[PDB]
Design a protein around this ligand. Sequence first.
Ligand SMILES: Cc1cc2nc3c(=O)[nH]c(=O)nc-3n(C[C@H](O)[C@H](O)[C@H](O)COP(=O)(O)OP(=O)(O)OC[C@H]3O[C@@H](n4cnc5c(N)ncnc54)[C@H](O)[C@@H]3O)c2cc1C
Ligand SMILES: Cc1nc2c(=O)[nH]c(=O)nc-2n(C[C@H](O)[C@H](O)[C@H](O)CO)c1C
Ligand code: SF4
Length: 508
Amino acid sequence: MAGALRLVLGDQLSDNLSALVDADLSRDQVLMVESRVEATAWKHHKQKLVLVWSAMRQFAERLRARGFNVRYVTLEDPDNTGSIGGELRRALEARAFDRVIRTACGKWGLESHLLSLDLPVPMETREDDRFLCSRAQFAAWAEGRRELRMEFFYREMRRKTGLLMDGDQPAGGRWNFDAENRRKLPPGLRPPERLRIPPNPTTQTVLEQVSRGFDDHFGEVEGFGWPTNPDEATAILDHFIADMLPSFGDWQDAMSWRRPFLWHSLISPALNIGLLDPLDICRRAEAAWREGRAPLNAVEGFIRQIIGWREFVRGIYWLKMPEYAQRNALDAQGKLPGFYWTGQTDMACVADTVRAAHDHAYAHHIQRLMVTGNLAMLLGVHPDAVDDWYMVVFADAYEWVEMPNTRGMATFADGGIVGSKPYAASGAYIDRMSDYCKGCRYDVKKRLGDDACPFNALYWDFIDRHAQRLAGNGRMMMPLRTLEKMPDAEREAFRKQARALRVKMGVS
Ligand SMILES: Cc1cc2nc3c(=O)[nH]c(=O)nc-3n(C[C@H](O)[C@H](O)[C@H](O)COP(=O)(O)OP(=O)(O)OC[C@H]3O[C@@H](n4cnc5c(N)ncnc54)[C@H](O)[C@@H]3O)c2cc1C
Ligand SMILES: Cc1nc2c(=O)[nH]c(=O)nc-2n(C[C@H](O)[C@H](O)[C@H](O)CO)c1C
Ligand code: SF4
């Protein structure tokens, strides 16, 4: 009866974590490690380092107030070995323990390493039931399905969770109210001001430490406004539910120059480390519709992102890894252009996305998908280099969610497991969906020449390069038909242009 050592990782900062259930406060110890292995696995955005480390330090103080004995190993500790496994060994030598208890993490490499660790005591690994769909439940649903479509999974999750269900029927008589013909913001509509969280004393200390010790990481730390504890995260969620949720379904795909937040919730960095709960978030949104404070299409569109896409991408990650991390369906071998890190590009849309990534460690979905993600696909950047960028620059970036959205939906490197079809688009899409192109130095109505918008020739070269494969796909009928009606001289023209753009941008 010596007690159990309970490991808590940087994205596991929840009281209801399975590793903390049924703890014996008089015998057990909680281990939390500020790990430089994890801090340099990718060179995370400086704001992500501030977010995680400030939140772990406050989460540890919260556990101590509840009677937990917490062994907190800071990054200034001269005896910190730097790794989770090394610090688990050091904690087991410090005193007697009967076993180690932990919760399955969200990175396959770390999870595989921990499962293979040879410790002096047994190590029990519990499932992370903070998610709404267990790993086993997704595998059971995916069994026998020749393709995994989010819509059928989303319907199952609506029945399991009972969210937006009247009896056995979905609210409103249909599952999905996704209204097509989405458009850019009207010229007079100014996006509202958003709530930011001024750093608390703990966050200020971590901020100064990150400014001084990790200066060679991407991004600015100044202006850090992310929530770092449940109260600050609830304040962000309260602000979204009351002030932005009613407009969620209107501008979900719009882009406005230097308005990086629009009406999005901005909860992913706090949700992904456990500061908010997925079921509680969705129930609050449903209650807004049930009590007449938000329309159904807005609330359903919001809940679909969380119980649908978020659970879907996690399901595919753990279902297909580790082979998923190595898939390269389009044989993309190019380098990532330097303006992804510096933002020094004449493409206004790309420059604004990198600017938001640098200044706020955030960019909303359609920019990650249709701007920087689409461009990396069209350019043929190696999927390893695209994964590294999305892991580094966004404060919500963890491999279980970053990779299926990046290697899958954004760049089709998984052959269509996640997205079922590549989301390629020319500058015409960005033009219809944003206010970028009129202020851009390029001309979105041109495909050849120095003034031509690079997305235009790169898009048609992409469809031309993968024409035979995309014909078997099926969902690319209209672009292939237009390409087939194009004379040979026009085909060779945008080909030459696309090769030149790949050289100009340092890709290949
Ligand atoms: C290339 C690419 C990379 C991405 N990388 C990440 C990542 O590292 N981490 C991450 O959390 N999300 C990632 N996403 C999903 C999505 O871009 C973000 O969840 C969202 O932009 C975060 O902003 P928000 O909280 O305001 O989202 P909202 O627009 O307010 O959406 C509400 C919530 O829905 C969830 N959600 C929405 N779309 C997705 C999605 N596609 N996958 C999973 N959850 C989703 C998030 O929890 C989000 O907080 C990525 C998407 C793409 C296309
Ligand atoms: C920056 C960072 N730092 C730490 C840390 O110091 N200690 C820790 O235990 N975890 C950290 N993490 C999170 C992990 O690297 C990893 O992404 C998640 O735990 C996956 O579940 C991250 C992302
Ligand atoms: S013209 Fe092309 S590069 Fe410029 S903002 Fe529009 S889509 Fe982006």
